[PDB]
Design a protein around this ligand. Structure first.
Ligand SMILES: CCCCCCCCCCCCCCCCCC(=O)OC[C@H](COP(=O)([O-])OCC(O)COP(=O)([O-])OC[C@@H](COC(=O)CCCCCCCCCCCCCCCCC)OC(=O)CCCCCCCCCCCCCCCCC)OC(=O)CCCCCCCCCCCCCCCCC
Ligand SMILES: CCCCCCCC/C=C\CCCCCCCC(=O)OC[C@H](COP(=O)(O)OCCN)OC(=O)CCCCCCC/C=C\CCCCCCCC
Ligand code: HEM
Ligand code: HEM
Ligand code: HEM
Ligand SMILES: Cc1cccc(-n2nnn(C)c2=O)c1COc1ccn(-c2ccc(Cl)cc2)n1
Ligand SMILES: Cc1cccc(-n2nnn(C)c2=O)c1COc1ccn(-c2ccc(Cl)cc2)n1
Lengths: 62, 48, 148, 378, 47, 106, 49, 71, 54, 51
């Protein structure tokens, strides 16, 4: 009653002994530029002004 | 002597955010199955 | 019968005022429990899906024959009179029973079996030489199928 | 008509991994045997990439290794996986042996004896591969070993002449160190399948030593999911070292190319051979060193015969486990001494602790198991 | 007829603790996310 | 065989009993013995009320270690109440092995 | 040869199998659209470019 | 060694609950740290004092090597 | 107490090659399946020598 | 121990020993043709070893 009253995704996802081994193949998507956030956001924040694309504009235009 | 110094400190960020996802989610598959055994009760009733 | 798996099995349909029990009971030796549970659970899941229009016609013929054969004397008719007045509040006649059997077909059977059996937690009881009675995780995972 | 029970391939998988009766109280120390099979497949895949670009030639070998680290794509991540994926093999191997010694698992005699064969073939394969980068530690570690191999009085002096290729150190010198290093990991694999054919006859031991045929559970789903959780926790700690400190465990002096015209300040093996190097230098003879080396690994076969206790495991034996951690704290002392200069304090400690390693296994353990029997009234 | 199943109230759900009137309804008012524990695992095993 | 300071060897036999902890799982001393081929023959010769008492005490202790638990300190097996139920049956199995061996040396 | 297929009540097993089937016909329409980084259906959705 | 062939047992009963009738973490840190503090007080009197004997040799073994090179 | 019938390694060899029931009238054409396993081990040993110098 | 010694095993060792010796001298002279032991091919000079 009070606990989560949403949908149940075990009458379709994962339940299959097949999916246990199909989520190397069918479950293998959706999350590469959702994690081009964080990875390419906190690397280029601690490294402020030190990488090559932060300084190349000096020796780009003559 | 170490030309891959910058490429490895960012590739070591693209897996630390992937083990913060994957590792809590196999640990909760583990606690689901083992709760059958963790809650069971035992009784011994021999003839008097 | 062909693999001498059991001595007997039966299904039951126990009812109450607000709830019920729906299931099966079987008797076998100590080396056949795990194989009896495999075949029983695979036929529940073949009625949630895949239930044919020929199976339902035979199951409707069986249900009418079990109705009139149970009322064949003053003692069984008197107990169908006395407890229909305490459950339904009236005695349902044998014409109202038959006009409810005439409506059922395979889509109703598939829909009503999926509602009660599919992906649900059963209650299990076992007594005797039962070391080959499978684990409850392996029991509860029998309550789906691997394709549908 | 269960296809998991009647198919000719699927029966063997079902009997070994799915429907296998397993004790219910198996702890985390039983996970490191499947981690050894994870570490072994990883070293075979990574090693086959590194063999496509290596050249066995004492003039052009230090340069073949720098070519993968600076020119070949992903060569820096595959090379430093291999050097660090062998330190992980050896930390899992020493936890695995200390488990079977603590819980009495050597009583499976045919399983334990194939294990001691696996401990020799692993320690020999990691020696042949460290000479292959051909730096200042790869040369001055191979000439320390072959001096102790030409002291065997009847076969010793013609045997080192065969492994060096008939010469000292030339092109056909590293061709035999490279050939035995390619082959022995595929023999470690076949000896590990025979290792588990003998464990299947009794099933597993359990922390209590008492048999457990009343309280079995199936292997799937309970330990197929608990092992997967332990294998992902291993790849986390492994990739931390490849991507944050890949030179933490090695040595800088192996980045100087091999040249006898100069001399390194120290001779230092890897961290997992330092206990076996503190025992060679502890005996001032080339015969009592090659015999005290092989006696440190062959003493494991006497462990079934030296057991004089009424119980199997050390869970209920509190004086016998007080001596189990004196044996672990003595292989730590032999690892610190093994990377020190041969000076005044580092030899009185190196020989008083090479004695205590043999006095604990052979003498002090079987006498303390008897005092325990006498206090339990047998 | 002398044995009784012992109580599981230290292991019950947040609400089925009271065993009176959650017969068939609230089998999904009990329930919509830890089945999806294995769903976001699919997306976590994914890349 | 001491007779004056037998006070001392009784304290050390009690101390090793409680430093060992098979009583905290509610076990008796003859439950924890390693079964070789002599012990597997002595178990087969027990009366059935003694055999059934031992199978349950072991199952309750394998289950207590699956959850890293200990019984409360009222169900711990006491020192002067451990019954050596197997030691009479095992001394006779060993004695019948040492007789078939002295007969093969003749 | 394959009169296993012909029957008045074997085609019962298809018309409820296709509401399952229709959807795994498009597991390539999401799965291998991602996985090769194909040029095909990327500019179709305005979110993913 | 299959399941209905391992042993012989009489007069024992087992009661078990479904995984879907149970909350995930019943007692996590109200019971967790008094259970770990029990297992630490037991096996630290057998494990630790062997490793402080390595420590007193290490601290003495590098206080003799550094006086071996000076006055 | 026949060790060919009770040893865990030796059972598998005994069942597959020693005590296996075989037809009595097997001719010469059934020999070329073990000759394929001879030709395969030979190509693997000879090929590993040629890979050290290529 | 007392499992092992007596008038039985050592008279089973009596007809063992010829077996042991011709299990030992099999290992002695058999090792020298496989691994090219040139220090023992000298002792019987009739066998032209290497050309
Ligand atoms: C100080 C050192 C002491 C000297 C040690 C030599 C004597 C050892 C001894 O006293 O008895 C041990 C025992 C002798 O058995 P035993 O004479 O019948 O009496 C003792 C017990 O019965 C124990 O006998 P067990 O039958 O229980 O032992 C199990 C069996 C192991 O099981 C086997 O039968 C091995 C069969 C697998 C072959 C490989 C298949 C292909 C892969 O023993 C062996 O056959 C040893 C061979 C293991 C290596 C085989 C692969 C080598 C290639 O076995 C050994 O000699 C161990 C040798 C293997 C380790 C050597 C380490 C490498 C150097
Ligand atoms: C890293 C630095 C090197 C140190 C490695 C060892 C660190 C591990 C210490 C763990 C501390 C600890 O908790 O010990 C107690 C711990 C708790 O369980 P108990 O309750 O005592 O078991 C039931 C008894 N009533 O005891 C155990 O688990 C023992 C289990 C076996 C340990 C497995 C490996 C131990 C280390 C082995 C390395 C040395 C031996 C290898 C021999 C190789 C021979 C060449
Ligand atoms: C390449 C090396 C090895 C591999 C792949 C390997 C593999 C395994 C595996 C998978 C198991 C079952 C799981 C487990 O109980 O942890 C096991 C058990 C065992 N291994 Fe190893 N092993 C290796 C080396 C060794 C060594 C060096 C020894 C001892 C000297 C050894 C002795 C044992 C024993 C005694 C057991 C059974 C323990 C028990 O059930 O209590 N193994 N091994
Ligand atoms: C099974 C366990 C193995 C271990 C413990 C091991 C160990 C090692 C070690 C320690 C090195 C030295 C690396 C360095 O210092 O840079 C090395 C190098 C090497 N190994 Fe492995 N190895 C194993 C398997 C293999 C296999 C199976 C192969 C080939 C198929 C292989 C091929 C090589 C090659 C080519 C090198 C070249 C030198 C280099 O790249 O550094 N190894 N090995
Ligand atoms: C299993 C069946 C195999 C077949 C049918 C086969 C066939 C061949 C053939 C036809 C050639 C060309 C021969 C020529 O030079 O005219 C060749 C060359 C070669 N093979 Fe194989 N091979 C087999 C296995 C292997 C294996 C297992 C290896 C390596 C471990 C290998 C390594 C090589 C190498 C290095 C060459 C180049 C050297 C040369 O050309 O002579 N082969 N192989
Ligand atoms: C074959 C055999 C024989 C005897 C005992 C045991 N064994 N080992 N430990 N326990 C409790 C046992 O019963 C085994 C199993 O060996 C192992 C160890 C890990 N895996 C494994 C894990 C995950 C996956 Cl996906 C696949 C395999 N299999
Ligand atoms: C002396 C010295 C210096 C530098 C490097 C290395 N070395 N060589 N390879 N690796 C990884 C190194 O660290 C060494 C060899 O050190 C030891 C000590 C005992 N073994 C040994 C034990 C068993 C077996 Cl079977 C084979 C060898 N090797």
């Amino acid at each position: 009653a009070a606990p989560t009253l949403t949908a149940r995704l075990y009458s379709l996802l994962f339940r299959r002994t097949s999916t246990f081994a199909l989520t190397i193949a069918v479950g293998a998507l959706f999350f590469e530029r959702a994690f081009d956030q964080g990875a390419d956001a906190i690397y280029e924040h601690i490294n402020q002004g030190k990488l090559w694309k932060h300084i190349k504009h000096k020796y780009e235009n003559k | 002597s170490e030309p891959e110094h910058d490429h490895r400190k960012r590739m070591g960020l693209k897996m630390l955010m992937m083990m913060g996802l994957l590792l809590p989610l196999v640990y909760a598959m583990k606690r689901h199955k083992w709760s059958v055994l963790k809650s069971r009760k035992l009784a011994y009733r021999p003839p008097k | 019968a062909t693999r001498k798996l059991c001595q007997s099995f039966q299904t039951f349909n126990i009812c109450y005022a607000e709830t019920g029990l729906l299931g099966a009971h079987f008797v076998c030796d100590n080396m056949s429990i795990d194989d009896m549970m495999f075949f029983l659970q695979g036929q529940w899941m073949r009625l949630c899906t895949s239930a044919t229009e020929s199976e339902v016609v035979r199951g409707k013929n069986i249900l009418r024959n079990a109705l009139v054969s149970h009322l064949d004397g003053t003692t069984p008719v008197c107990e169908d009179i006395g407890r229909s007045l305490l459950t339904y509040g009236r005695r349902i006649p044998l014409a109202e029973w038959e006009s409810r059997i005439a409506e059922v077909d395979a889509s109703v059977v598939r829909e009503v079996c999926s509602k009660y059996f599919y992906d649900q937690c059963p209650a299990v009881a076992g007594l005797g030489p039962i070391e080959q009675l499978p684990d409850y995780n392996r029991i509860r995972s029998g309550m789906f199928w691997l394709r549908f | 008509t269960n296809i998991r029970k009647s198919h000719p391939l699927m029966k063997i998988i079902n009997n070994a991994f799915i429907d296998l009766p397993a004790p219910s109280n198996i702890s985390s120390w039983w996970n490191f045997g499947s981690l050894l099979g994870i570490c072994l497949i990883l070293q075979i895949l990574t090693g086959l990439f590194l063999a496509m670009h290596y050249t066995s030639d004492t003039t052009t070998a230090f340069s073949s290794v720098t070519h993968i680290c600076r020119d070949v794509n992903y060569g820096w991540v595959i090379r430093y996986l291999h050097a660090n994926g062998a330190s992980m093999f050896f930390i899992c191997l020493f936890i695995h042996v200390g488990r079977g010694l603590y819980y009495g698992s050597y009583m499976f005699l045919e399983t334990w004896n194939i294990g001691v064969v696996l401990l020799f073939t692993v320690m020999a394969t990691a020696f042949m591969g460290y000479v292959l980068p051909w730096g200042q530690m790869s040369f001055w570690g191979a000439t320390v070993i072959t001096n102790l191999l030409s002291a065997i009085p009847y076969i010793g002096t013609d045997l080192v002449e065969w492994i060096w290729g008939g010469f000292s150190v030339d092109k056909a010198t590293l061709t035999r160190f490279f050939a035995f290093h390619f082959i022995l990991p595929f023999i470690i694999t076949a000896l590990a399948a025979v290792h588990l054919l003998f464990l299947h006859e009794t099933g597993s031991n359990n922390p209590t030593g008492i048999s457990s045929d009343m309280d079995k559970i199936p292997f799937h789903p309970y330990y197929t999911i608990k092992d997967i959780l332990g294998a992902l926790f291993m790849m986390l700690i492994l990739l931390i070292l490849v991507l944050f400190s890949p030179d933490l465990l090695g040595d800088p002096d192996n980045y100087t190319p091999a040249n006898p015209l100069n001399t390194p300040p120290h001779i230092k093996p890897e961290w997992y051979f330092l206990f076996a190097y503190a025992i060679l230098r502890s005996i001032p003879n080339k015969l009592g060193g090659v015999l005290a080396l092989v006696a440190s690994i062959l003493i494991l076969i006497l462990m079934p015969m030296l057991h004089t206790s009424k119980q199997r495991s050390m869970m209920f034996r509190p004086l016998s486990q007080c001596l189990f951690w004196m044996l672990v704290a003595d292989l730590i002392t032999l690892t610190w001494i093994g990377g020190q200069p041969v000076e005044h304090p580092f030899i009185i400690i190196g020989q008083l602790a090479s004695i205590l390693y043999f006095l604990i296994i052979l003498v002090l353990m079987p006498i303390t198991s008897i005092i325990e029997n006498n206090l339990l009234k047998w | 007829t002398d044995i009784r199943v012992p109580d599981f109230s230290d292991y019950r759900r947040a609400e089925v603790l009271d065993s009176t009137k959650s017969s068939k309804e609230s089998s999904d008012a009990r329930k919509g996310f830890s089945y999806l524990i294995t769903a976001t695992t699919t997306v976590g095993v994914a890349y | 065989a001491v007779a004056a300071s037998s006070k001392w060897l009784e304290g050390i036999r009690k101390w090793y009993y409680n430093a060992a902890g098979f009583n905290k799982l509610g076990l008796m001393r003859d439950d924890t013995i390693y079964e070789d081929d002599d012990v597997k023959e002595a178990i087969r010769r027990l009366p059935e009320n003694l055999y059934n008492d031992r199978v349950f005490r072991i199952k309750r202790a394998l289950d207590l270690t699956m959850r890293q638990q200990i019984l409360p300190k009222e169900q711990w097996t006491k020192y002067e109440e451990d019954k050596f139920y197997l030691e009479p049956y095992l001394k006779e199995v060993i004695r019948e092995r040492k007789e078939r061996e002295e007969w093969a040396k003749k | 040869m394959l009169s296993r297929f012909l029957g008045p009540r074997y085609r019962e097993l298809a018309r409820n199998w296709i509401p399952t089937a229709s959807m795994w016909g498009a597991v390539g329409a999401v799965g291998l659209v991602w996985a090769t980084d194909w040029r095909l259906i990327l500019d179709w959705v305005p979110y993913i470019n | 060694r299959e399941f209905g062939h391992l042993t012989r047992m009489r007069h024992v009963i087992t009661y078990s609950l479904s995984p879907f009738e149970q909350r995930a973490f019943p007692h996590y840190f109200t019971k967790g740290i008094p259970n770990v503090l029990r297992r630490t007080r037991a096996c630290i009197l057998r494990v630790a004092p062997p490793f402080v004997v390595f420590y007193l040799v290490y601290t003495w073994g590098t206080q003799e090597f550094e006086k071996s090179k000076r006055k």
